[PDB]
Structure 1
Amino acid sequence: RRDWENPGVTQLNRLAAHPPFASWRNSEEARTDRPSQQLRSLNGEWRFAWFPAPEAVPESWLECDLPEADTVVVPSNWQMHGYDAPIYTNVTYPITVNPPFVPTENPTGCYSLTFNVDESWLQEGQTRIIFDGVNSAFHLWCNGRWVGYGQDSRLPSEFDLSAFLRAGENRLAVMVLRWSDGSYLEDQDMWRMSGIFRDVSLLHKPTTQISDFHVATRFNDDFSRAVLEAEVQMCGELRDYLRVTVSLWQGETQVASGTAPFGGEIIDERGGYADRVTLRLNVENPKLWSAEIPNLYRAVVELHTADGTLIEAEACDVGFREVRIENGLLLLNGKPLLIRGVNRHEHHPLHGQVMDEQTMVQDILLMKQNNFNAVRCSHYPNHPLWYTLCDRYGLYVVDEANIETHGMVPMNRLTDDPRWLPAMSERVTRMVQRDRNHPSVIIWSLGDESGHGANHDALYRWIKSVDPSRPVQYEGGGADTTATDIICPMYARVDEDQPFPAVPKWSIKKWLSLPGETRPLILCEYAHAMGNSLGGFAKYWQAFRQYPRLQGGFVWDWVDQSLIKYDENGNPWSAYGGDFGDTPNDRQFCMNGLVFADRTPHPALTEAKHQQQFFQFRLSGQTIEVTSEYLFRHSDNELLHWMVALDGKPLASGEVPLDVAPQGKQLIELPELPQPESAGQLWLTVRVVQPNATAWSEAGHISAWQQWRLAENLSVTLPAASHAIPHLTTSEMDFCIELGNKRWQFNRQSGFLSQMWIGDKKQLLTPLRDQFTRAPLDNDIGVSEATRIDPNAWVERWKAAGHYQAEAALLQCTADTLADAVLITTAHAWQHQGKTLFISRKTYRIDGSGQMAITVDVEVASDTPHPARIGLNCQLAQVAERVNWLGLGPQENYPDRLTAACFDRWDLPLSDMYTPYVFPSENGLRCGTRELNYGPHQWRGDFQFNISRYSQQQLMETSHRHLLHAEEGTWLNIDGFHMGIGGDDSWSPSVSAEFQLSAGRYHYQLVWCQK
């Protein structure tokens, strides 16, 4: 019998799913959520053995331990131990598509454990084993006898072991198969791994036991009265003395309580459920649950004899909140949500897909620190602890089934096939049966990227029938099918329609108002944070806030899916698809995160925070208007900090308490400002500071900021007339200008400033030449590979037009000596196949004050793909420690991703100006700069720049960040103009038109000097 190749069989002898149990026998331990002695952990050291296929496991293995076995940590993924390779493939199945068959060579992993069982446990009561997560299907033996079988990689599989165990020493044997008919529904865009990867545990229940419980909370019209409604189910022999008591606690007060015998209401012509009882507790003025204020009451479900003997107590955290869609909005406790969400995969760089508390918490605090309030379980039910943290710390969660059939042609081929409705139902019902009493789950999802098939309709309805407290969403089949209560497209652009056939991604603003449309829209995936990305983020939030029915989205995604490899020396590095002998593979597409796998944040993460702010600001003369975007909480942990500066020079600053009601407003008057006497632009900068620490933030946390321009007085006063006049010395090869101990050289055969000297030390390593290219970002590149070109990729259009192999061509090199300055005039052309791509017309002016004034006017051929940048580079000899600039910072910014950056005087170490994306590209730019200092040099103007030890050439050549070597000197790029980075998605051009460089003609001017 080949059960792993049969969608008719997804389990054998597996127990019914249910909410989390611990089988407490002291009601007080249950109340306080302390450990229970009836819930043992079996996590630790086990005996592992790898085999190429199930047919190749020795028959002795069932009875005796294998000599060639190893001792390994369970839970784990055997790939993370090196037994075989993890595979990164997005869409295409890692297997031959031949349902329901799998490869014959089926990497098989043979886990065993020798553990001890106390005698008491076996004398009375049921003993079961719980496999929280096994990938992707496994058989189970206990002491040589066969126990059962199970599929689904992401929901617990439970097995009654009462009849199999003995006193003291016992032995498990778990035959985990990598490939199974399960895998056809587990085709998510993520590393393919396997094994026993979540907790293993033993559960001792009484024979007469609580077998299930459902908590429901409904309200009156203003949430001042609530009825908690708990349905309890039991197994065992029914007796009149039996009772369930349900008691609700807020901290340590008991606020409500209900006691009844078993025997539910009459349901039909045969009567009612003898083995169920429903308790109804009235609760005046309940404290409501939200992400803002995550209030939690505690429910204790006691099964006991009426005369007062506790049989067992089970329990859960309860949060009084109401989720519904009325008149086209998604309401929570009456109010319209704004979903500042992120998609988060369960991933660790060392541990693979094995989740731990420390990392989950690290993830949550950062999420909440950067202004998120929601997270999608993409694309499976998470480790059970995760919901508990979301319950407690406060987050809106979308719980999503382990169903993805992305590799199918068409994508619905399995989801429309009735013979797959059994395996799909199991993946939806068992999630619901497991998670339905977690407050943090507000939305149920039917899975991911699996077309639209009658099965989606069937299961959608099943949920709706079983659980009306949570709306049901599903993106498949074009995001607005009959299987979704919410339009939830992935990567639908704000303004631009992408009218694909059958499944068009309409513009979000447009989608809402389609004939007969009324539903709310919350993107399930948007802003594809792969590499240098999130260009266009502000465009969504402006929209989100303007349109009531646009209620947010979920970014793709949270954490880069990189893995650690070690080199010859034992030094660690970050690996992506293909780096494991895995073939085929989608290379670096596993890394679409806001943070690196170690949780160091991409610069993209700051923009998200600033846009996801909970306070909005307007300025009107000398009045700041603060508006709250909170639905429930006041601003009881907020002070407003303001600062006025003349070009980075602090002039004044104050502090005013924020006392803003939810959705309310505060008007703040600033003192009459001192009106400055010297030239420059003023900048007002408000910051919202949280003076007090919280569960999720430190004292002083900045949760919001904003800048404005105030008065500007333009410099009209002249520079002092310097008496000295620079000497031009014309040679055969060079126009050499001199001033004091300062020296310029202009190679006349190339037409560039080829050297400088301060005193007598050389200042340059490469000549100062124009640049109209960049080391391509992931969004420039997209799906394009050497063997499958996408000629519509920005990079591939740039290559074809000859941008990267465009040779300069000298047209003019002239010197003029003036009254008090020497003037150099150059003109250039870049050509590819008899085609002038660009033309650059320059003037250099060196005066008696030793300040070189460069003027650059560039022509761009109207029919060459709009250029990546319009600027200059050189390779200075200088390597300094500090970069000081007056401009946008402190972090990396680009034209279409620069809202979170502030205009000010910044100062940082040189390595902070390099941004270490695993896949190396252009990086570290800061726009809107008026002054740049780097050692002896100063640049003034109005430009964008980056500075590092990495040439654009080395960047575009190198495949991995760790393979980069610090080049000699410092490479500087000073752009007058720079193309946006885009990132609406990352496999089609996504840089919005107003961010592409199409003006045709460009002009920028730089004063270059030494101080």
Structure 2
Amino acid sequence: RRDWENPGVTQLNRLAAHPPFASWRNSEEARTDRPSQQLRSLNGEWRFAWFPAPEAVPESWLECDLPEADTVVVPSNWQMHGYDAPIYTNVTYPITVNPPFVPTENPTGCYSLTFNVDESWLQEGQTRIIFDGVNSAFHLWCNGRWVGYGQDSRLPSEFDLSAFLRAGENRLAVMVLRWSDGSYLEDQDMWRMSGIFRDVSLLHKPTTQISDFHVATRFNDDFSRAVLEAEVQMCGELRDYLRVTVSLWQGETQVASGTAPFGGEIIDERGGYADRVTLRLNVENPKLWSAEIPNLYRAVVELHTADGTLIEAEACDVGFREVRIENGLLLLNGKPLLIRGVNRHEHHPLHGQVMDEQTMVQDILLMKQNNFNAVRCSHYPNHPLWYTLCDRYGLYVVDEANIETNGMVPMNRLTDDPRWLPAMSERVTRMVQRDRNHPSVIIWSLGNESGHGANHDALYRWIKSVDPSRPVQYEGGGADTTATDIICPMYARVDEDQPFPAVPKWSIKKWLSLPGETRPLILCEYAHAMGNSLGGFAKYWQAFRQYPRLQGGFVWDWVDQSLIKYDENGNPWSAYGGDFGDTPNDRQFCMNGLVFADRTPHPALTEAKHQQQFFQFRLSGQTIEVTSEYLFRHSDNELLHWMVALDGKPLASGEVPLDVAPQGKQLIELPELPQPESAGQLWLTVRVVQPNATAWSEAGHISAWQQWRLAENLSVTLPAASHAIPHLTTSEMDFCIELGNKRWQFNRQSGFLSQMWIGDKKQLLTPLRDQFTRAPLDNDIGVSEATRIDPNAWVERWKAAGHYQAEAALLQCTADTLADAVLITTAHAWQHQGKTLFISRKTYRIDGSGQMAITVDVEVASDTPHPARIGLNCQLAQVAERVNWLGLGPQENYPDRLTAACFDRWDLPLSDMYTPYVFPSENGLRCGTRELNYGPHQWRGDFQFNISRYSQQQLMETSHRHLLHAEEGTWLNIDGFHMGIGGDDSWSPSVSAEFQLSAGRYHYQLVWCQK
């Protein structure tokens, strides 16, 4: 039959989809959510054998264990066990596009289990097996007899085993195909793996049972009243004595209950559903659910007899909330949402695509701790627990059908074809049937990157009709089609339009007002966090706050999909596309997270946290204005901490309790803040602290902060005329300057400070030289490849212009002795093939004070691509333990990504000055720095810098972080200027003009001294 090559067969003998069941036989257990003896797990150790194709599986396997099989843990992805390689491809399908066929060499995993079944389960009732996730298609046998088949790797497939089992020992045999026709609908940009990667369980149901139940909550105008409606369906023999009772509980209290016999109202000329019933319960002043306050009730559905005997009970958590779009705005409980979202794939560096409670909780806590309130299921239904956690911890969720055909040409080739309507339909409908009762799900999504085809319009309509309580969104086909309630573009920029034909990406501000457009706009993906990224983040937040119809977005994305590999010594390292022999592959494009695979944050996470703050502030005089962006809660677990410092030196501080109503303001008058007795800039820093612990945070958690410059007293007190006069010694090849125990050496042939001493200790390993380039960020590279250069990518422009190869030609080097100092003057030209790219003119003034003042004036040819940086670099000889600076910090910060960083005095270990991006590049810059300390050196000025043990040369030539090695000494990059890093996307230039170095003439000055 080759069912796996036929879109017309998506399953055989599969039971209908429905919400989570447990078949409890005790009401209390249902109410409290305890475990159910009627729901058993089959996860654990199973037998497994790999084959290259389904045709190679021995028939003996159906009846007996293969002696060649191994014992492995289930759930699992077999690539994680090393049976075959996982494949990292982004858009291009991993198999030849020739629907609906797949490769003849189609890796097959034969899983089997021997287990016990108690006669009590067989003597009455129904025993079904549930596979929550099997990728991508499979056949099932039980005791050698064929049971059925299923597709859709991301939703549960359930079969009735009632007639196949025997009391005692039983054996299940599952033949899992890596590729199937379902793979044409599973082209998400992630690792391509396979196996039984979700839970397996057995559920016992009475023959007369609850087969489905749907819970809805509607309200009055101001939400002080609601009605909960629960429709319940049964299977089995109808009897006049059956009843259903639905009761609602707030904690230990039963707030409402209703009971009725089966028999729904009249539907049409033929009557109504004799097998269903709807109970309606009134609820006064319900406690409402939101991500701010995830209040939940418990609904218990009991199927029983009139005389009181329970047959079975099912139940769910209920969140009383209304989701609606009105007048162009997405409202939750009547208030307009501001989505601080993130897209999150299901990814574990060791376990592949298997998800566990611990990792999910870790992700949720980190999200909430970082000010996210929403998550998009990119791009498939998630493991069932996810929703439970969202409901209880409080996150808004976008539940998304497992449908993505990115690699088709054109993209909607399958989605516009009615022959593919059936398969797509089940990916949508089975998702709704499973998740419709979770209150955290507030929006349904038709899938991702599958163009816009008629099948999408049909499925949009189905959802609208079946579940009017949640908007439907879908971005394919230009993000504003007839199959979406929300304009939900991916990577549309704030101000810049990208008028691509047919599917333009307009500036979001502009998009909202196009003629006749009225919907809200929430980006389904934006701020591509690949590598050193998130430049321009604040630009989106500022727009979201100013435009009512700009209601936020989902950052792409949560966590790097890197996988662990081990070297010859068993030491683990993070691997990306191609590292498993997979080819073709998309290299590092699988790593775009705010967090590394092990959940350690990348520096962009703090930028996100700050911009997504729920409190906004203004400073006027001695008054701080705090505005709340919460929609529902008062700031009942917050206090404002304030601190005033002069050039880093604490001067005054305090705390004030915060008492702000949702959307309100509170004015806070700061105490007289006496004048500092010294030159310097006074800075005011505020932070909102949560004194009390919460379910998702520790006492003392900082939720928001902001800084402002207060008075500044310029230094007008001239030197202290001091004593020694430096002395100049000239030779033909150098200029040497001596000052006591310190010496400085300027090579006359190169024109650079080539050496410096403190005592007899040389301080340099490499001369101080200008530097106009950076080890390219992933945003600088984009999709450029050696085998396929993208000439428009910054890195290519740079390379083509000869920036990385340019040679400094000395134009001048003079020495002058002044009264109390020595003055060296140099001028150099960088050229490439005859063209002059940059001109550097400097002065170095050395005084009796031992300070060397450097002045740098650079010219950049208007016609060469704007350079990545304008600074100096050198290799210092020592290695010191700490780095201390007065400037933006403490984490890595770039011009277009520095809002979260605060100006203060920071001191960290050297290692913290390096960001270990898996694909290495320029990293660890701190901007707005007035003073930098390392070892015996001190540099003062107004610059940006990075310091670490890796040269830019090494960063650029090394593709994986585990391969870098500490060089001798310390490499210091000190920049007068540095280009933005971008990130609106990582495939086309994205550094906004205000952050490109295009002024043509630049000036910077630094004093380097030792102390």
The TM tier, using the shorter chain, reads: over 0.9
Separation (CA, whole Å) in 1 of partners of 2:128 and 2:361:
29
Separation (CA, whole Å) in 1 of partners of 2:646 and 2:727:
38
Equivalent position SS for 2:9: coil
Separation (CA, whole Å) in 2 of partners of 1:570 and 1:241:
66
Equivalent position SS for 1:511: helix
Equivalent position SS for 1:857: strand
Runs in 1 of length 4+ with deviation above 6 angstroms?
none
Separation (CA, whole Å) in 2 of partners of 1:672 and 1:125:
78
Farther off after superposition, 714-723 or 519-528: 714-723
Output one character per residue of 1:943-987: Cα deviation in whole Å (capped at 9) or x when no partner: 000000000000000010000000000000000000000000000
Output one character per residue of 1:749-770: Cα deviation in whole Å (capped at 9) or x when no partner: 0000000010111100000000
Separation (CA, whole Å) in 2 of partners of 1:322 and 1:407:
37
Separation (CA, whole Å) in 1 of partners of 2:862 and 2:94:
45
Separation (CA, whole Å) in 2 of partners of 1:108 and 1:509:
50
Equivalent position SS for 1:940: strand
Output one character per residue of 1:230-268: Cα deviation in whole Å (capped at 9) or x when no partner: 000000111010000000000010000000000000001
Separation (CA, whole Å) in 1 of partners of 2:674 and 2:185:
67
Separation (CA, whole Å) in 2 of partners of 1:965 and 1:756:
26
Aligned residue for 2:666? Answer: 666
Give structure 1 stretches of 5+ with no counterpart: none
Output one character per residue of 1:381-417: Cα deviation in whole Å (capped at 9) or x when no partner: 0000000000000000000000000000000000000
Equivalent position SS for 1:522: strand
Output one character per residue of 1:87-123: Cα deviation in whole Å (capped at 9) or x when no partner: 0000000000000000000000000000100110000
Output one character per residue of 1:702-737: Cα deviation in whole Å (capped at 9) or x when no partner: 000000000011000011101211111101211000
Q: Please report how far the alpha carbon of residue 298 of structure 1 lies from its aligned counterpart in structure 2 after TM superposition.
A: 0.2
Separation (CA, whole Å) in 2 of partners of 1:673 and 1:477:
58
Output one character per residue of 1:609-658: Cα deviation in whole Å (capped at 9) or x when no partner: 00000000000000000000000000000000000000000000000000
Equivalent position SS for 1:724: coil
Equivalent position SS for 2:405: coil
Separation (CA, whole Å) in 1 of partners of 2:554 and 2:314:
34
Separation (CA, whole Å) in 1 of partners of 2:13 and 2:570:
47
Separation (CA, whole Å) in 1 of partners of 2:316 and 2:719:
75
Q: Please report how far the alpha carbon of residue 685 of structure 1 lies from its aligned counterpart in structure 2 after TM superposition.
A: 0.4
Q: Please report how far the alpha carbon of residue 849 of structure 1 lies from its aligned counterpart in structure 2 after TM superposition.
A: 0.7
Give matches, 1:21-100, under 5 Å: 21-100=21-100
Output one character per residue of 1:764-814: Cα deviation in whole Å (capped at 9) or x when no partner: 000000000000000000000001000000000000000000000001010
Separation (CA, whole Å) in 2 of partners of 1:901 and 1:234:
58
Equivalent position SS for 1:634: coil
Aligned residue for 2:243? Answer: 243
Separation (CA, whole Å) in 2 of partners of 1:204 and 1:140:
19
Separation (CA, whole Å) in 1 of partners of 2:388 and 2:323:
19
Give matches, 1:936-947, under 5 Å: 936-947=936-947
Equivalent position SS for 2:588: helix
Instruction: Percent identity, please.
Output: 100
Separation (CA, whole Å) in 2 of partners of 1:24 and 1:709:
63
Output one character per residue of 1:318-376: Cα deviation in whole Å (capped at 9) or x when no partner: 00000000000000001000000000000000000000000000000000000000000
Equivalent position SS for 2:228: strand
Q: Please report how far the alpha carbon of residue 846 of structure 1 lies from its aligned counterpart in structure 2 after TM superposition.
A: 0.4
Separation (CA, whole Å) in 2 of partners of 1:849 and 1:654:
40
| TM-score using structure 1 length | 1.00
Give matches, 1:477-492, under 5 Å: 477-492=477-492
Equivalent position SS for 1:268: coil
Separation (CA, whole Å) in 2 of partners of 1:591 and 1:673:
47
Output one character per residue of 1:30-68: Cα deviation in whole Å (capped at 9) or x when no partner: 000000000000000000000000000000000000000
Equivalent position SS for 2:888: strand
Aligned residue for 2:376? Answer: 376
Separation (CA, whole Å) in 2 of partners of 1:673 and 1:688:
20
Equivalent position SS for 2:988: coil
Matching of residue 391 in structure 1 with residue 391 in structure 2? yes
Q: Please report how far the alpha carbon of residue 865 of structure 1 lies from its aligned counterpart in structure 2 after TM superposition.
A: 0.2
Give matches, 1:756-771, under 5 Å: 756-771=756-771
Give matches, 1:198-237, under 5 Å: 198-237=198-237
Output one character per residue of 1:917-967: Cα deviation in whole Å (capped at 9) or x when no partner: 000000000000000000100000000000000000000000100000000
Separation (CA, whole Å) in 1 of partners of 2:687 and 2:202:
51
Separation (CA, whole Å) in 1 of partners of 2:777 and 2:520:
34
Aligned residue for 1:698? Answer: 698
Separation (CA, whole Å) in 1 of partners of 2:35 and 2:654:
50
Separation (CA, whole Å) in 1 of partners of 2:89 and 2:253:
53
Aligned residue for 2:578? Answer: 578
Equivalent position SS for 1:243: strand
Matching of residue 894 in structure 1 with residue 894 in structure 2? yes
Matching of residue 11 in structure 1 with residue 4 in structure 2? no
Equivalent position SS for 1:535: coil
Separation (CA, whole Å) in 1 of partners of 2:850 and 2:948:
26
Separation (CA, whole Å) in 1 of partners of 2:535 and 2:142:
55
Separation (CA, whole Å) in 1 of partners of 2:675 and 2:820:
36
Separation (CA, whole Å) in 1 of partners of 2:629 and 2:520:
19
Separation (CA, whole Å) in 1 of partners of 2:660 and 2:165:
62
Q: Please report how far the alpha carbon of residue 677 of structure 1 lies from its aligned counterpart in structure 2 after TM superposition.
A: 2.0
Q: Please report how far the alpha carbon of residue 676 of structure 1 lies from its aligned counterpart in structure 2 after TM superposition.
A: 1.4
Equivalent position SS for 1:174: strand
Q: Please report how far the alpha carbon of residue 816 of structure 1 lies from its aligned counterpart in structure 2 after TM superposition.
A: 0.4
Output one character per residue of 1:652-704: Cα deviation in whole Å (capped at 9) or x when no partner: 00000001000000000011111112100000000000000000000000000
Separation (CA, whole Å) in 1 of partners of 2:332 and 2:987:
36
Separation (CA, whole Å) in 1 of partners of 2:367 and 2:468:
29
Q: Please report how far the alpha carbon of residue 992 of structure 1 lies from its aligned counterpart in structure 2 after TM superposition.
A: 0.1
Separation (CA, whole Å) in 2 of partners of 1:868 and 1:670:
42
Give structure 2 stretches of 5+ with no counterpart: none
Separation (CA, whole Å) in 2 of partners of 1:912 and 1:934:
14
Equivalent position SS for 1:461: helix
Separation (CA, whole Å) in 1 of partners of 2:955 and 2:488:
37
Separation (CA, whole Å) in 1 of partners of 2:347 and 2:691:
33
Equivalent position SS for 2:527: strand
Q: Please report how far the alpha carbon of residue 581 of structure 1 lies from its aligned counterpart in structure 2 after TM superposition.
A: 0.4
Give matches, 1:29-178, under 5 Å: 29-178=29-178
Output one character per residue of 1:502-558: Cα deviation in whole Å (capped at 9) or x when no partner: 000000000000000000000000000000000000000000000000000000000
Equivalent position SS for 1:80: helix
Q: Please report how far the alpha carbon of residue 822 of structure 1 lies from its aligned counterpart in structure 2 after TM superposition.
A: 0.4
Equivalent position SS for 1:358: helix
Q: Please report how far the alpha carbon of residue 5 of structure 1 lies from its aligned counterpart in structure 2 after TM superposition.
A: 0.2
Separation (CA, whole Å) in 2 of partners of 1:959 and 1:328:
47
Separation (CA, whole Å) in 1 of partners of 2:34 and 2:673:
58
Aligned residue for 2:716? Answer: 716
Aligned residue for 1:863? Answer: 863
Separation (CA, whole Å) in 2 of partners of 1:349 and 1:673:
51
Separation (CA, whole Å) in 2 of partners of 1:657 and 1:910:
37
Separation (CA, whole Å) in 2 of partners of 1:699 and 1:26:
39
Give matches, 1:448-459, under 5 Å: 448-459=448-459
Separation (CA, whole Å) in 2 of partners of 1:599 and 1:841:
46
Equivalent position SS for 2:606: helix
Separation (CA, whole Å) in 2 of partners of 1:961 and 1:422:
46
Give matches, 1:451-600, under 5 Å: 451-600=451-600
Separation (CA, whole Å) in 2 of partners of 1:934 and 1:704:
31
Separation (CA, whole Å) in 1 of partners of 2:398 and 2:414:
24
Farther off after superposition, 454-463 or 717-726: 717-726
Aligned residue for 2:1006? Answer: 1006
Separation (CA, whole Å) in 1 of partners of 2:497 and 2:3:
46
Aligned residue for 1:790? Answer: 790
Equivalent position SS for 1:682: strand
Output one character per residue of 1:117-151: Cα deviation in whole Å (capped at 9) or x when no partner: 01100000000000000000000000000000000
| TM-score using structure 2 length | 1.00
Equivalent position SS for 2:55: helix
Equivalent position SS for 2:140: strand
Aligned residue for 2:774? Answer: 774
